Amino acid sequence: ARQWQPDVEWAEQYGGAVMYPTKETAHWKPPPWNDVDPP
């Protein structure tokens, strides 16, 4: 066998706005990649 390393499903658990989704925290899009918002 081969040592297991994370796949896309595992990594997407850390790509959200918050670790523990709830009702209030839904719709929280992650911040922009460069801290700039549309004018």
């Binding site: 066998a1 081969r2 040592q3 297991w4």
Partner: protein
């Protein structure tokens, strides 16, 4: 103890400055040389322990555990060569660095004269151990196993730090020699009940005590082979060694505080043996087998009799050699069929006749066949507990029956029977594997001839 600390440090430059194809050879040879010099610690006197300096000392309890610790590093290096083959050069030399830094902390832990220096090195072993499990384990469950192994230990260690500092402020010193002459009896008060719990629960989580053991079937299963060997051969004995030292300053409160922890161990000794009869994983079967034996050590330490301590010390050394041997055996099968299910590869005695001889000897020591030191240590604990309460023979007799049942059920399941037809890649046993088993079993049997060097300070 500098004559052993400095050589161990020099293994790290040796590994990194060696030829790219001689890391396993130089490391193995020089660690074996360090082990040979460890026999000089047996200059033990009948009245006074061996006191080297203001930081380090050795007595009859430290010597057997130190010699065992330095004899385990070469064995770990041999067992790790196979599965660390396609690993790149740099990460292989980091793996060996973790093993050496783990031996460096262990030898200083078993010889620290002051009880806070013991705490620092006792806790320092977590870092290298955690890194081995979480970085070189195979399954996806190694990450959660690492978290369980980390936070179980610290939940008990942190209260221990407070208790030790409190003792120094009151007593004035933590030197173990000083405590032997300045120790005062512990009064019965609510504050002193929690001082007792803090000093002990740190060591109960590592034995482990039944109930606080859920990390052991996760760490010992998801770790690499070298992780399981050191985890189940030395690291469990840190707690047992810790208890034997710190019970000096808890009398007479141990008379009644030991009751809840003697019942968990005595009854937990039967739950863990029974769980082995139905485990579907060969490596997890050996892990639970460790909880049962270490339950005897907890009972022996808590009743504080000369026979119990002699039995406790003998049991700890005997288990370390026998448990590490079983993990190696289960690993050799895994390296061929690359699976841990016990009912997958059967009738292996037909294909690997010699490796089944090692299986037989390992099981005989596991079920305490006389005159092995496994039996000597267990017997003395049974004798001591009979004086404590004659009814305990009932529980310690039932565990003997179950112990022989799962020891030989594992032997029969994998060695006897009929071989699996579709498993066709059972190559013969390499000299590396056969030598690995001979370095576990030969010292285990030789100690039967002169068993007084593993009976501890009360011999």
């Amino acid at each position: 103890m500098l004559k052993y600390i400095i050589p161990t440090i020099m293994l790290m430059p040796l590994t990194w400055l060696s030829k790219n194809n001689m890391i396993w050879v130089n490391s193995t040879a020089h660690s074996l040389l360090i082990s040979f010099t460890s026999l000089l610690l047996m200059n033990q006197f009948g009245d006074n322990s061996l006191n080297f300096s203001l930081l380090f000392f050795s007595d009859s309890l430290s010597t057997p555990l130190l010699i065992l610790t330095m004899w385990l590093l070469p064995l770990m290096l041999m067992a790790s060569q196979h599965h660390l083959s396609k690993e790149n050069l740099t990460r292989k030399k980091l793996f060996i660095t973790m093993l050496i830094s783990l031996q460096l902390f262990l030898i200083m832990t078993f010889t620290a004269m002051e009880l806070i220096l013991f705490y620092i090195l006792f806790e320092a072993t977590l870092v290298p151990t955690l890194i081995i499990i979480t970085r070189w384990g195979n399954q996806t469950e190694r990450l959660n196993a690492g978290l369980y192994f980390l936070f179980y230990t610290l939940a008990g260690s942190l209260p221990l730090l407070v208790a030790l500092i409190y003792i120094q402020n009151t007593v004035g010193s933590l030197n173990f020699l000083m405590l032997q002459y300045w120790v005062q009896p512990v009064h019965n008060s609510w504050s002193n009940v929690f001082m007792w719990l803090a000093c002990m629960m740190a060591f109960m989580v590592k034995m482990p005590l039944y109930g606080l053991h859920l990390w052991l079937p996760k760490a010992h299963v998801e770790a690499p082979i070298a992780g399981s060997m050191v985890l189940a051969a030395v690291l469990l004995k840190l707690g047992g060694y810790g208890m034997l030292r710190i019970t000096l300053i808890l009398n007479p409160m141990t008379d009644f505080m030991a009751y809840p922890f003697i019942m968990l161990s005595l009854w937990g000794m039967i739950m863990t043996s029974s769980i082995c009869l139905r485990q579907t994983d060969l490596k997890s079967l050996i892990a639970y087998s460790s909880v049962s034996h270490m339950a005897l050590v907890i009972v022996a330490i808590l009743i504080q009799t000369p026979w119990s301590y002699m039995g406790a010390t003998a049991l700890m050394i005997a288990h370390g050699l026998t448990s590490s041997m079983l993990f190696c055996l289960a690993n050799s099968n895994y390296e061929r069929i690359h699976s841990r299910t016990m009912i997958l590869a059967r009738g292996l005695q037909t294909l690997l006749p010699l490796m089944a001889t090692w299986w037989l000897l390992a099981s005989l020591t596991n079920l305490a066949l006389p005159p092995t030191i496994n039996l000597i240590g267990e017997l003395f604990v049974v004798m001591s507990t009979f004086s404590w309460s004659n009814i305990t023979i009932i529980l310690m007799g039932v565990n003997m029956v179950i112990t022989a049942l799962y020891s030989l059920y594992m032997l029969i399941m994998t060695q006897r029977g009929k071989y699996t037809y579709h498993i066709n890649n059972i190559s013969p046993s390499f000299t590396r594997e056969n030598a690995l088993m001979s370095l576990h079993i030969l010292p285990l049997l030789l100690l039967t001839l002169n068993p007084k060097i593993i009976l501890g300070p009360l011999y």
